[PDB]
Design a protein around this ligand. Structure first.
Ligand SMILES: Nc1ncnc2c1ncn2[C@@H]1O[C@H](COP(=O)(O)OP(=O)(O)OC[C@H]2O[C@@H](O)[C@H](O)[C@@H]2O)[C@@H](O)[C@H]1O
Length: 376
């Protein structure tokens, strides 16, 4: 498989299907009122970048290999909603053109290198950013994930595969507004950092297929052991994305403030939007011990304990909303048939929004996601 992706306001989709995907230079030349949302800070950065052969970056159209990236995230936290946005799919076939350029990351950034087709090396390395589900500044992944194919002047509408959209309601309105069965409108929340599936059990409790860290819950729970290693699993991702959490985990562990059955709440004053978005909600981390050593299995008395702790202390500690992952359901080697009900039993008591994040490496029978099973 492969497509390329252009992020735009959904108001522009008819204009694009008619005129094409135009460079920010071609919009000025043609005196078009393409009513879009990119902060002036970004616009004045993209223009001010010059290239080889008497050419600017704003003369090209930016087709991302991965649209689920810091730019899309920046637009959504700057007040724009998923219903306001559309990702326009462009066929692999545009790469056959010999007047295009390919960036190894964010075209604007100095550190990024733009190559012409002839002199490109390690393309399989560039296009792999399509498989990146998160990023960070330190390893440059926050730059690399916005790797793009730069097409000069315009992109002919005959190169457009489909238009991706946040939900079914936005799809119906666009299907009518473009009036062309031949161009699919696909609803896919995952492009817009929305869950793949949500099952509401109560007003507050829901089950979620998705990424916990792109949930907007105020407290993210993290399954840990009682040694000091976050070697493999979800803990591994926490160590790379949120290394200060790892340090707090170790410090708290070796000060007995985190024992098996005694969760530690890290009231992290860091802003998650600033780190994730391209450069005022708080995000805390709850360290929940589900086992003793990183080798041996998860114990149910350690979980029951931790869940009771949450019920007793969410008021005291000022937890506004909570994301817990399926506890011990991965490396721990416990089954959702046992943990699911146990977690629901306790977290249904919470008078705040709660998202239990279903295990992603594992098929749950549909009947084990019903409230009949989980709340009885
Ligand atoms: N981004 C994510 N969003 C939601 N769920 C996720 C995500 N990433 C992983 N999961 C799911 O979370 C579940 C629990 O993750 P694990 O880390 O495997 O938790 P556990 O089984 O309790 O193992 C704990 C052990 O591993 C380390 O995390 C920890 O240091 C301890 O040694 C898994 O089933 C996995 O599918």
């Amino acid at each position: 498989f492969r497509e390329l992706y252009y992020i735009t306001h959904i108001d522009n989709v008819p204009s694009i299907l008619e005129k094409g995907i135009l460079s920010h230079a071609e919009i000025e030349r043609q005196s078009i009122n393409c009513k879009k949302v990119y902060d002036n800070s970004i616009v004045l950065k993209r223009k001010s970048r010059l290239l080889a052969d008497n050419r600017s970056l704003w003369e090209f159209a930016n087709l991302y290999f991965q649209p689920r990236n810091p730019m899309l995230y920046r637009l959504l936290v700057q007040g724009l909603k998923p219903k306001d946005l559309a990702i326009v799919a462009v066929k692999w076939t545009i790469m056959k053109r010999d007047d295009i350029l390919i960036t190894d990351g964010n075209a604007a950034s100095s550190e990024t290198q733009i190559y012409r087709k002839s002199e490109i090396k390690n393309i399989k390395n560039i296009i792999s950013v399509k498989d990146m589900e998160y990023w960070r500044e330190e390893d440059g992944s926050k730059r690399k994930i916005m790797a793009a194919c730069l097409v000069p002047q315009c992109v002919d509408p005959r190169y457009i595969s489909a238009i991706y959209v946040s939900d079914h309601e936005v799809a119906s309105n666009l299907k009518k507004a473009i009036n062309n069965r031949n161009i699919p409108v696909i609803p896919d929340p995952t492009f817009f950092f929305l869950p793949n599936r949500e099952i509401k059990l109560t007003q507050n409790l829901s089950l979620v297929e998705g990424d916990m860290f792109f949930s907007r819950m105020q407290t993210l729970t993290v399954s840990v052991n009682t040694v000091g290693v976050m070697g493999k699993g979800l803990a591994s991702r926490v160590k790379y994305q949120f290394p200060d959490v790892y340090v707090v985990f170790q410090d708290a562990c070796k000060k007995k403030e985190l024992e098996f059955g005694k969760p530690y709440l890290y009231k992290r004053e860091s802003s998650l939007d600033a780190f994730l978005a391209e450069d005022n909600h708080q995000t805390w981390f709850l360290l929940f011990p589900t086992k003793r050593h990183w080798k041996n299995m998860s114990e149910i008395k350690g979980i029951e304990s931790g869940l009771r702790w949450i019920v007793e202390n969410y008021k005291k500690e000022g937890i506004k909303s909570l994301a817990v992952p399926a506890l011990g359901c991965g490396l721990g080697g416990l089954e959702w048939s046992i943990v699911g009900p146990l977690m629901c039993r306790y977290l249904t008591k919470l008078e705040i929004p709660v998202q239990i994040y279903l295990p992603l490496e594992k098929r749950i029978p549909d009947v084990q996601l019903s409230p009949k099973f989980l709340l009885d």
